[PDB]
Write a protein that binds this ligand. Sequence first.
Ligand SMILES: CC(C)CN(C[C@@H](O)[C@H](Cc1ccccc1)NC(=O)O[C@H]1CO[C@H]2OCC[C@H]21)S(=O)(=O)c1ccc(N)cc1
Ligand SMILES: [Cl-]
Ligand SMILES: [Cl-]
Ligand code: NA
Lengths: 99, 99
Amino acid sequence: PQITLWKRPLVTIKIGGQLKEALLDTGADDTVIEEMSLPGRWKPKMIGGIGGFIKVRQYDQIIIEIAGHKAIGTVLVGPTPVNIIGRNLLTQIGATLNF
Amino acid sequence: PQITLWKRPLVTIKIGGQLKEALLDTGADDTVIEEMSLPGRWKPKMIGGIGGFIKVRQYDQIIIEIAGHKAIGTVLVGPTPVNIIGRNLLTQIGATLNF
Ligand SMILES: CC(C)CN(C[C@@H](O)[C@H](Cc1ccccc1)NC(=O)O[C@H]1CO[C@H]2OCC[C@H]21)S(=O)(=O)c1ccc(N)cc1
Ligand SMILES: [Cl-]
Ligand SMILES: [Cl-]
Ligand code: NA
C-alpha cells in the first residue's frame, strides 16, 4: 500500500495469535509493544525517547505479522504508550518513505 | 526521493534561518525541534512519548524547508533529544510510506 500521513499510520499486527493495533514509526529504531507474554528468554535494553529512557525486555526472533506481511525479528516489550513498529521490522516488510 | 529504512531517515532542514538535521518521523504527530528562537507568538504545551512528557513552546505558521521542499505549520520547540519532522509537515511535502 501507499499510506499517507494525514492520520496516524496504524495497522493491525498479529503476535502470539493475537491481533493488536500498532503505529508504523520511521522514527523508531526498534519495535516496542505494550506488556504481553512472549516465548523464550529476554535480554535487557534501555531505549530513549522524547521524555527520557525506559527499560524494556528484548525478545529476539519473534514471529509477527504486520499489515499482512510476515516478519521475524526483535520485539521490545515495555511501557510504551502505543505499540510501535520500528525500522528493524519496517525493513523486513519492504517499507520505504517516499516524497 | 525514495528513502529506505536501513538507517535513520535523516534529512537537512532549514528553519528560522538555521540548517539542522532532523528525523522524518511517521510516528510523531507534530514536529519538535531542539531549543532555538522562532519569531512570533507561542503558547506552552506538553507532549508525551516513550519516557513521559516534556514541556515545549508551540509556534504556529512557521516555514520550514525539508530536504528542499517548503512547508508551513506548527513547530514545537523544547528539550527533545532529536529534531523530529512529524506528520503535520510530512503531509505537506507529500510523504508516504510504501510497501
Ligand atoms: C513514541 C511515538 C508514539 C511518539 N514519538 C515519535 C517516535 O518516532 C520517537 C522519536 C524519537 C527518536 C529518538 C529519540 C527520541 C524520540 N521514537 C522513539 O521513541 O523510538 C524509540 C524506539 O526506538 C528507539 O529509536 C529511537 C529512540 C527509541 S515522540 O518522539 O515521543 C513524539 C511525541 C509527540 C510529538 N508531537 C512528536 C514526537
Ligand atoms: Cl500544523
Ligand atoms: Cl495527499
Ligand atoms: Na506564529
